[PDB]
Amino acid sequence: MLKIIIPTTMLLPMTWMSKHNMIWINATVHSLLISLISLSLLNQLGENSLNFSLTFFSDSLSAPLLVLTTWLLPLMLMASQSHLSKETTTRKKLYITMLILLQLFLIMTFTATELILFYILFEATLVPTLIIITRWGNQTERLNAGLYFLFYTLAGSLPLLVALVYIQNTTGSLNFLIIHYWSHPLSNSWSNIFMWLACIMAFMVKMPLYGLHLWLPKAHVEAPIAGSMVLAAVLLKLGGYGMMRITTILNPLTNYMAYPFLMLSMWGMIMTSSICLRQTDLKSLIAYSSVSHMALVIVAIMIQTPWSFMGATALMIAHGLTSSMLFCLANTNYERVHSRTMILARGLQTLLPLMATWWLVASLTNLALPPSINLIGELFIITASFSWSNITIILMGMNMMITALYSLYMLITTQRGKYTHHINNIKPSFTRENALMALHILPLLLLTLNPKMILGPL
Amino acid sequence: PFFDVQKRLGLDLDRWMTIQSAEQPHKIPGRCHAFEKEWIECAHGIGGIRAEK
Amino acid sequence: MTMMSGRPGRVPLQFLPNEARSLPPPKLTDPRLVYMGFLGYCSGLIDNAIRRRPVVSAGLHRQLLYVTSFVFFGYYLLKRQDYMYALRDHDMFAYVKSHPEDFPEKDKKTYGEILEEFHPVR
Amino acid sequence: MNPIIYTTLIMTVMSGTMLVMISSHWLLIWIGFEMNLLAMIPVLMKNFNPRATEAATKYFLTQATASMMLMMAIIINLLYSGQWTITKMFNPVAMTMMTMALAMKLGLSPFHFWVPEVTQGISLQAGLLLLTWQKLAPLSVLCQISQSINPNLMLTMAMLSILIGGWGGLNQTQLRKIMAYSSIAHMGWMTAVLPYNTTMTILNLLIYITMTLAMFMLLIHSSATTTLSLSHTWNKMPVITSLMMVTLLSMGGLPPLSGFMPKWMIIQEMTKNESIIMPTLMAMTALLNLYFYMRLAYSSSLTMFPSTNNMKMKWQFEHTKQMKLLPTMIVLSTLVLPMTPALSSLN
Amino acid sequence: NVLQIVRDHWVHILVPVGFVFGCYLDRRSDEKLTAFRNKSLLFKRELRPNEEVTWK
Amino acid sequence: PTIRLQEDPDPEDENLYEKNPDSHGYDKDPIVDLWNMRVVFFFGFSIVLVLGSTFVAYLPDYRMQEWARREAERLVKYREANGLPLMESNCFDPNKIQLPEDED
Amino acid sequence: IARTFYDGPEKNYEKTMAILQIEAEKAELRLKELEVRRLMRARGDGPWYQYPTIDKALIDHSPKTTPDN
Amino acid sequence: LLDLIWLETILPKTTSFIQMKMSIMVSNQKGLIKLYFLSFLITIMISMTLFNYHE
Amino acid sequence: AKTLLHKYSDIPEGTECHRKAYASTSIGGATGLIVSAYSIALKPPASFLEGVARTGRYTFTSAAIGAIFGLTSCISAQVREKPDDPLNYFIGGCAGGLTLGARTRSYGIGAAACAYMGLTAALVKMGQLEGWQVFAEPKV
Ligand SMILES: CCCCCCCCCCCCCCCCCC(=O)OC[C@H](COP(=O)([O-])OCC(O)COP(=O)([O-])OC[C@@H](COC(=O)CCCCCCCCCCCCCCCCC)OC(=O)CCCCCCCCCCCCCCCCC)OC(=O)CCCCCCCCCCCCCCCCC
Ligand SMILES: CCCCCCCCCCCCCCCCCC(=O)OC[C@H](COP(=O)([O-])OCC(O)COP(=O)([O-])OC[C@@H](COC(=O)CCCCCCCCCCCCCCCCC)OC(=O)CCCCCCCCCCCCCCCCC)OC(=O)CCCCCCCCCCCCCCCCC
Ligand SMILES: CCCCCCCCCCCCCCCCC[C@@H](O)O[C@H](CO[C@H](O)CCCCCCCCCCCCCCC)COP(=O)(O)OCC[N+](C)(C)C
Ligand SMILES: CCCCCCCCCCCCCCCCC[C@@H](O)O[C@H](CO[C@H](O)CCCCCCCCCCCCCCC)COP(=O)(O)OCC[N+](C)(C)C
Ligand SMILES: CCCCCCCC/C=C\CCCCCCCC(=O)O[C@H](COC(=O)CCCCCCC/C=C/CCCCCCCC)COP(=O)(O)OCCN
């Protein structure tokens, strides 16, 4: 699959050789072309994966993730060029270089055939994200956010590395196909328990799991808009993809090692949904929303059924699109009024009607209105959990009630009521912002038209 | 670590003084010449791990 | 521990024994050589940047020398690395051949005769 | 100092190290150490001031004690076996004394106190020499006598060195002391894998030397010895601060940078034996070094600190002396991971 | 006059050229994994009177 | 000086509509702005969206859904014709399986 | 679309077979190398882990002014 | 109570506190050769008894 | 030395609790003596009697922690009739941590020491059960 990797590496010098006032145009055009090329990976088989070479392969789980990454790059470029107008040419090129390097690392991460190569790329994604956050964030807290983003990740991933090399000394291979075909059960010993924890905790902190999630509100609030987009839409899904890959060697230990994580996921989903009800910062609300949806995904991965895996795949794709759109919507208001307080600017439907329509559609997809793929993933996970235990419908049910509430709360706070009298600098929406919202939302409904493309290998 | 310059060039910078069974002036023998000679001839060429046993 | 220092017949500071001449040399389009040339080009660009010269255009002779030197060293480095891996494989196979008691080939069993425990997922 | 005399002293330092590296006789190894120390003392005092004199005195006391213990271990080994050849060290008491003497020479914990003081008391060029070239001889001897090592003692000292390097580096605003604590932690990493594989020790030493050379050369290029003086460099030459930031990230061990390669390799080697707990502890501890590297990167490259008016004058002049090996050192410090299998050429 | 146009818009061939080069390298990679071509039990087939290989 | 430092004042934000009443919000240069709008709209909606959706909609059946349906139709026809059960609880022939000799 | 952009299933099938063969052989070779390393380091009877001993060519086989050496 | 206080208190704040205290303990030495040469003597005796007597 | 370690470890888990407590007390006292030696070397106490006081304080703290851990762990193993169970070591470790907290008169120290020492002791017991090696002898 070098036909996708090489054009991004070519985006790099194309950006660094462009004329000073053509960087955005060229980057956007060729990013969109690369997304169009990557669209061909959706032609998948029913039996095995597309094994391109000894190094790269494509499954029915990673292809929609690659398509989402390549589609998110142009949207990030469109969202970034407004607040970077005053920047120097070299620093703008460096920012675009960070975005391109992040895309390259993600593309290679989602298609690596070996687990150590996957680990190396999945750690390599850290550097551009940290640089973006700590260099182009707006407030002084960004520095702290960066630290919280880094060590929380590494404290999870350093044990995993050890486990990985240990496994290669035991079975002789880390190739995923060999690992799947030559699978052997895990006995019930303390050594196996700690191997399970080492294999699981890095992905758990990536999702993130409730209790290990404190880095996420900081990092996703303090980051620039493109950073928040790529953190919510793609980088959270690394944990889910890695967990679904790694669980093939953890049976039957998972059968009882999942209980603390299942309890944490369900109760913390309720807790983060409740937290969303009392939030003064609009970005923090969206971050805690991401935490709740990812708790659902964790439950789906932990119960290990075909329906739960399909639901997890659909939910990851849908959440990526929806959360990126919500972050962009909040960023428009922030750029207008330079404040993230939700109750500062009210009654925006009177001043910006089309943006209010975009807000309504985004909040409708957040609460999983049928037949959106958000609802499809949520319903598949809920059905699988009901099969796992009939009592789960209580907690899941409560979540469905809370989500809508806070979702509509957000809308009602920003669009309805009366406008703030002293805010007189609310200009009409630009074509760029409307196009960004449309390019977020139209693929969601188009995917609803054909849902088997995001349902995964199961 | 050890660059065997002496072995590569055949110089003998310090090997003349490593053992007591090696060409003393006036052929004066060490007190334990025979024992060291026997041990060296036993251990020659088989490596330290095998020689230790 | 040192695996290969005391390997019999090893010339102290050779860097390339004559036996290594029996191995196929790396191709001049080897991707590792291309990456070494890329490292040389990056070194030239950084040299231009540190000296406050136009990064891409300042010295073409200097950049050419950078790339050439990196490729020239990389060729011999790759030759030595391939020789060392060939030596390791040769020694491993000879040792397995000379100690059949420690490496037995046991009887093969098909999956229709192997009892594997089934763990249901529910 | 006369340039001729300085060249002669540097050549004598290198000759002592080479004599240690090529000798087969314990007496010649000890002589190499003596000659190296004798030539090294004046190099530390090149720029004469009380701090340099104090650093030279402390260094001399430490190294002379280490050499006395070295000679006593050699003599005990000779007493229990009339052997002068550097070999499997037939006596265990002599081997313990030898290990302690070599650790004191290297600055491993708990014989670590002199390293930050001597590094802070000397110039940046002397610090470069002390933290790069001075590690070769003791590590070469340790590689030669590795099969007789007691793993408990060396592993204890290595773990202590990693812990103490991280904790001590956490507290520093002076760049030389930061470099010294980083050196202590990296020596701990080098000696942790020595009883299992000396090739990994050599690989870690080479990568550490490359990164340290790039670091010290960047610090000499921008005449900064404190965090606050390094926080001005962005307003004079931003390229230097950006390269410094990437080099610091590599020294922190982050993939896909080159500084990740040794630890990775070492961890793998330790899992080829049983050795599971120790590598996990070592990585979790190296997170501390990463933390204070990241703090330095925050101060110098990722944020902009306030500057002074007179800096405008510095804008009008260029760097006179140029380091010819700095770009290659930076490239080797950062973009070398894909060539990892070439480590086979080290054994 | 095409000199200025070329020197302003020559960066627009880098990504298509990279796409073509990636396709070529993928074909080269496929060329190195033919050890079981027309040899699997499921797809083993007698050659046509003209064709030389079953796939490229 | 009762001050702490010499600093530029925080500047007011620029309105793109002041110098360009129809500004599209892409660039301060009107021509570069217009062409950024045009390329975004052409390569985002016209090329990737519609043509990509058409390409995905007509992707050939490599998942073998229709093949599986036809195979199941043949199997059901044959089994119902000969009176065999439609499906067997065993997917592997027991004659190719060797159970352990003793269960006691 | 199939004729223009894609190949038949046999290509991917047999490429998978080749990849699996290569990877399985590599895994077996890794396990074998680990076992050989263990045995060679334990016994010291192979080319690896050969530690230097004193050269017997250093011995002087001359009369030593005393008949009994 | 949970997200802003106790979850902060257990994992990240405790780690920061412990690392800072250990850094203060380790790095705060007067630079007197007398004290840490006495430390060297203690280390040598301990290494001769604990590790060397057991072979 | 390893003589004290062997004296502690030779006695079976849930038998002869007084002897195991005595051995643990000796181990703790030795650890406290080493700690006090290093502390006096690096931080001079300005008086000989003050140095004796600091040595006695550190040694008594360590010996009390060791005695409490050994007694509680052995008693738990004997009462539950469940040797080779890490829960006994966890309980002993938390008892030692609470002893440390009372010794320093701090509730936060007591709680943190209970948690961390219990976890560490349970990990040590798991290591003895499964054969985990801290200082692995070279194998390959
Ligand atoms: C993985 C896949 C492969 C990836 C490989 C790895 C990445 C790429 C290679 C890395 C090394 C390459 C470049 C090294 C020298 C660059 C140094 C520099 O300063 O650049 C300025 C220079 C511009 O200077 P100028 O033109 O003279 O005028 C502007 C002034 O100088 C104005 O200059 P100024 O000094 O006044 O401006 C100040 C500025 C100056 O500061 C900088 O410019 C930063 C540069 C640091 C160099 C990188 C460090 C060392 C390399 C390690 C990279 C690690 C990568 C791994 C991931 C971890 C990320 C860290 O500093 C700042 O503004 C502070 C910003 C704070 C942000 C901190 C982030 C820095 C780290 C990010 C590094 C990312 C990688 C490189 C990014 C691209 C850089 C050009 O940039 C360039 O134009 C050169 C780059 C493009 C040349 C290559 C094109 C090849 C030919 C075209 C055709 C392609 C052929 C294809 C074949 C097919 C045929 C059709
Ligand atoms: C992801 C989801 C979320 C995950 C994480 C989020 C949740 C976890 C984190 C949040 C909670 C963890 C906090 C731990 C304790 C914090 C203490 C502290 O920070 O010290 C610094 C802080 C600083 O103080 P200071 O500077 O040293 O001196 C000033 C003092 O404040 C001045 O002191 P004072 O004069 O005012 O009075 C103090 C005195 C008296 O305090 C008072 O004056 C008022 C009375 C309060 C004491 C209440 C005890 C009696 C009531 C308890 C009833 C049963 C418990 C509920 C369970 C029911 C089961 C069906 O307390 C004592 O003397 C201590 C004696 C010990 C008795 C209490 C300990 C019982 C432990 C619980 C055993 C549970 C076993 C498992 C059960 C399984 C079945 C569910 O200390 C305090 O101020 C607090 C002192 C009392 C705290 C102890 C309360 C324990 C709470 C339950 C612990 C359960 C979690 C840990 C279990 C895992 C460990 C292996
Ligand atoms: C803030 C959120 C962070 C992320 C959350 C991560 C969740 C991790 C929780 C781990 C889940 C279970 C771990 C091990 C499985 C069983 C644990 C034990 O309690 O069960 C009994 C174990 O018995 C006793 O409980 C012994 C263990 C007691 C010591 C463990 C310390 C736990 C105390 C709480 C400390 C907090 C840990 C987390 C720190 C943050 C079962 O009896 P037994 O059949 O014999 O053991 C099975 C293993 N065998 C078969 C090899 C023997
Ligand atoms: C961070 C990047 C690391 C780069 C380090 C510096 C690179 C440039 C230095 C160039 C080396 C010059 C050597 C070439 C002259 C020939 C010398 C030859 O005779 O020496 C041989 C030795 O060969 C050298 O060791 C090979 C040097 C090559 C090192 C490169 C490996 C780095 C690891 C992989 C990272 C990628 C590197 C990319 C390169 C640009 C003799 O072997 P021997 O006398 O018996 O060994 C003695 C020590 N023993 C016995 C204990 C083992
Ligand atoms: C920001 C928070 C992130 C926290 C994540 C960190 C927690 C990760 C879990 C702990 C990792 C330990 C596993 C290390 C690698 C395991 C590989 C393995 O299988 O090794 C076992 C050995 O297992 C061990 O030795 C591991 C023991 C644990 C030592 C380190 C303790 C670390 C802390 C333990 C408690 C915390 C774990 C859960 C934390 C959850 C997150 C809060 C087999 O070795 P053998 O010796 O060959 O066994 C058979 C022959 N005897």
Which of ligand 3's atoms lies nearest the C-alpha of I87?
Answer: 28
Q: Among candidates A365, A349, A346, A367, which has minimal Cα distance to A357?
A: A349
Q: In this structure, what DSSP letter does residue B25 have?
A: G
The C-alpha angle with vertex A426 and arms to A421 and A429, in degrees rounded to 5, equals 145
Helical H segments across chain D, by residue range: 3-22, 26-44, 50-80, 92-106, 114-121, 124-132, 136-144, 151-169, 175-192, 198-221, 227-230, 238-251, 260-272, 277-297, 311-314, 326-334
CA of H46 to the centre of ligand 3 (A): 37
The answer to whether the CB of I112 is under 6 A from ligand 2 is no
Query: Rounded distance, CA A300 to CA A307, Å?
Result: 8
Query: Rounded distance, CA A394 to CA A25, Å?
Result: 51
Cβ burial, residue D54 (10 Å; 0-12/13-18/19+): middle
Q: Give how far D201 is from chain A: nearest CA, Å.
A: 19
Q: Which residue among E33, E43, E54 places its CB closest to the CB of G18?
A: E33
Contact A408, A414 (CB under 8 A): no
The C-alpha angle with vertex D163 and arms to D190 and D290, in degrees rounded to 5, equals 80
Residues B7, C6: C-beta atoms closer than 8 Å: no
Q: Nearest residue CA, atom 4 of ligand 5?
A: A156
Query: Rounded distance, CA A346 to CA I131, Å?
Result: 65
Query: Rounded distance, CA D105 to CA D67, Å?
Result: 8
DSSP secondary structure string for all residues of A172-238: S--BHHHHHHT--PPPSSHHHHHHHHHHHHHHHHHTTPTTS-THHHHHHHHS-HHHHHHIIIIITHH
Torsion-angle region of F2 (φ positive above 0: left; ψ -120 to 50: alpha; else: beta): left
Q: Residue D130, Cβ neighbours under 10 Å: how many?
A: 23
Torsion-angle region of F93 (φ positive above 0: left; ψ -120 to 50: alpha; else: beta): beta
CA of A94 to the centre of ligand 1 (A): 8
Helical H segments across A39-140, by residue range: 62-80, 89-111, 115-124, 126-136
Experimentally, how was this structure solved? cryo-EM
Q: Which residue has the tokens 């006036």?
A: B26
Helical H segments across F12-98, by residue range: 16-19, 30-41, 52-57, 65-82
Name the CA radius of gyration of chain I, rounded: 16
C-alpha torsion sign, points C49, C51, C52, C53: negative
Give the three-class secondary structure for I16. coil
Find how far residue I12's CA is from the centre of its chain: 17
Contact I124, I89 (CB under 8 A): yes
Residues I1, H36: C-beta atoms closer than 8 Å: no
Interface partners of E (3+ CB pairs, < 8 Å)? A, G
Residues 6+ apart with CB under 8 A from E28: none
Ligand at shortest distance from the CA of D244: 1
Residues 6+ apart with CB under 8 A from F83: none
Query: Rounded distance, CA B20 to CA A49, Å?
Result: 71
Q: Among candidates A191, A121, A122, A199, which has minimal Cα distance to A165?
A: A199
Q: Among candidates D329, A40, A438, which has minimal Cα distance to G2?
A: A40
Contact A240, A301 (CB under 8 A): yes
- Chain discontinuities in chain G, listed by preceding residue (C to N exceeding 2.5 Å): none
Query: Rounded distance, CA F20 to CA F26, Å?
Result: 11
The C-alpha angle with vertex D252 and arms to D247 and D256, in degrees rounded to 5, equals 75
Residues 6+ apart with CB under 8 A from C90: none
Find how far residue D259's CA is from the centre of its chain: 14
What are residue A156's phi and psi, to 5 degrees?
A: -90, -35
C-alpha distance from residue G29 to each of A307, C7, C92, G36, G40 (Å): 39, 21, 9, 10, 16
Q: For residue D110, say if its preceding peptide bond is cis, omega within 30 degrees of 0.
A: yes
Query: Rounded distance, CA C1 to CA A176, Å?
Result: 32
What are residue A58's phi and psi, to 5 degrees?
A: -125, 130
Q: Which residue among D271, D276, D287 places its CB closest to the CB of A154?
A: D287
Give the three-class secondary structure for D187. helix
Q: Give how far F92 is from chain G: nearest CA, Å.
A: 24
Name the CA radius of gyration of chain B, rounded: 14
- Confirm or reject contact between D274 and chain I (CB < 8 A): yes
Query: Rounded distance, CA A307 to CA A314, Å?
Result: 11
Give the three-class secondary structure for D189. helix
Q: Nearest residue CA, atom 8 of ligand 3?
A: A260
Query: Rounded distance, CA B2 to CA H24, Å?
Result: 41
Q: Among candidates D101, D122, D126, which has minimal Cα distance to D111?
A: D101
What are residue D131's phi and psi, to 5 degrees?
A: -90, -10
Q: Which residue has the tokens 């002390």?
A: D130
Counting ligand 5 atoms within 8 A of each CB, the residue from A186, A194, A214, A249 with the most, and so the one to mutate, is A194
Q: Does chain G reach chain H with at least 3 CB pairs under 8 Å?
A: no
Q: Among candidates A167, A284, A265, A278, which has minimal Cα distance to A216?
A: A284
Ligand at shortest distance from the CA of H1: 2
In angstroms, this model's resolution equals 2.5
Q: Residue F9, Cβ neighbours under 10 Å: how many?
A: 5
Minimum CA–CA partner of G9 in chain F: F62
Query: Rounded distance, CA F70 to CA D62, Å?
Result: 86
Angle between helices A431-449 and A353-366 (to 10 degrees): 30
Query: Rounded distance, CA D147 to CA I138, Å?
Result: 9
To the nearest 10°, the Cα dihedral for G23, G26, G30, G32?
A: 120
Query: Rounded distance, CA B27 to CA G65, Å?
Result: 6
The one-letter amino acid at D168: G
Bridge partners (DSSP) listed for residue D226: D174
Q: Among candidates A111, A101, A119, A8, which has minimal Cα distance to A56?
A: A111
Buried b (16+ CB within 10 A) or exposed e, D38-49: ebbbebbbeeee
Query: Rounded distance, CA I96 to CA I110, Å?
Result: 9
Q: Residue D132, Cβ neighbours under 10 Å: how many?
A: 17
Name the CA radius of gyration of chain C, rounded: 25
H-chain CB neighbours of I37 within 8 Å are 42
Query: Rounded distance, CA A455 to CA A372, Å?
Result: 13
Query: Rounded distance, CA D161 to CA D146, Å?
Result: 19
Residues 6+ apart with CB under 8 A from C14: none
C-alpha torsion sign, points A426, A432, A435, A436: negative
